[PDB]
């Protein structure tokens, strides 16, 4: 079941089209280094302001 | 016990009859056909007993160098039962062989899709 074309009508329910992808295998996580990075930017920003 | 023995044979055969390959399928079809066979007419015993009496040389059952088996033309009854068995088997085959969709082909495709992906 292709996301691009099909020569005949051949309606496919949405669940089957959704099931045909590799979205789950691709993880969505963020590095830990952002937490220390942003906080440092927030710390110095307050320090300079005071 | 004899009735229980026959029930044992029935149950024994029941758990072997419950598609794997063409190799075994051929054998299963053949032995079903054998199970539907009716041998031992009045012909075979007469043929065994008659020409054996005057067996001057060579036996009627010898086939190492027998010659007559080439010219065995059957009778009408045997060919008739051939045709009826074939027709019955053909009819049996034709008997056993037989909204998310816009058309009947789309329907069959969706049922195929359902068969393959519903597990996932």
Residues of B in contact with A1 (CB under 8 A): 113
3-state secondary structure of B108: helix
Closest to A15 (Cα-Cα) out of B103, B100, B107: B100
- Return the residue in B99, B104, B106, B108 with the most chain A beta carbons within 10 A, the one to mutate for interface testing: B106
Q: Do A8 and B117 touch (CB under 8 A)?
A: no
Please tell me the distance in Å from A38's CA to the nearest CA on chain B.
41
For every residue of B51-82, which 3-state class applies, written as one string? HHHCCCCCCCCCCCCCCHHHHCCCCHHHHHHH
Residues of chain B found within 8 Å of residue A8, distances taken between Cβ atoms: 105-106
DSSP letters, B26-57, are HHHHHHHHHHT-----HHHHHHHHHHHHT-SS
Does B91 touch chain A if contact means CB atoms closer than 8 Å?
Answer: no
User: Among B119, B101, B23, which residue's Cα sits nearest to residue A12?
Assistant: B101
Under DSSP, is residue B95 helix (H, G, I), strand (E, B) or coil? helix
The answer, for B89 touching chain A at a CB cutoff of 8 Å, is: no
Torsion region of B59: left, alpha or beta (phi above 0 gives left; psi -120 to 50 gives alpha) = beta
Of B103, B105, B113, the CB nearest to A12: B113
Solved using:
cryo-EM
Q: Which two tokens stand for residue A48?
A: 């300079």
Q: Side-chain half-sphere of B56: how many Cα atoms within 13 Å?
A: 0
């Amino acid at each position: 079941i292709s996301n691009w074309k099909n020569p005949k009508g051949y309606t496919i329910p949405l669940d089957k089209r959704l099931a045909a992808d590799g979205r789950g295998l691709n993880d969505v996580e963020i590095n830990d280094g952002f937490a220390k990075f942003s906080e440092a930017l927030y710390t110095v920003e307050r320090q300079a302001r005071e | 016990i004899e009735e229980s023995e026959k029930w044992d044979q029935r149950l024994r055969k029941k758990k072997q009859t419950i598609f794997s390959d063409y190799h075994s399928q051929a054998s299963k079809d053949y032995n079903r056909g054998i199970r539907d066979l009716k041998p031992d007419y009045e012909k075979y015993d007469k043929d065994k007993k008659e020409e054996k009496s005057k067996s001057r040389s060579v036996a009627l059952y010898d086939e190492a160098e027998r010659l007559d088996w080439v010219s065995n033309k059957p009778d009408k009854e045997h060919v008739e039962r051939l045709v009826e068995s074939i027709k019955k088997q053909d009819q049996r085959r034709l008997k056993n062989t037989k909204i998310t969709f816009i058309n009947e082909r789309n329907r069959k495709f969706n049922l195929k899709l359902q068969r393959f992906y519903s597990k996932y």
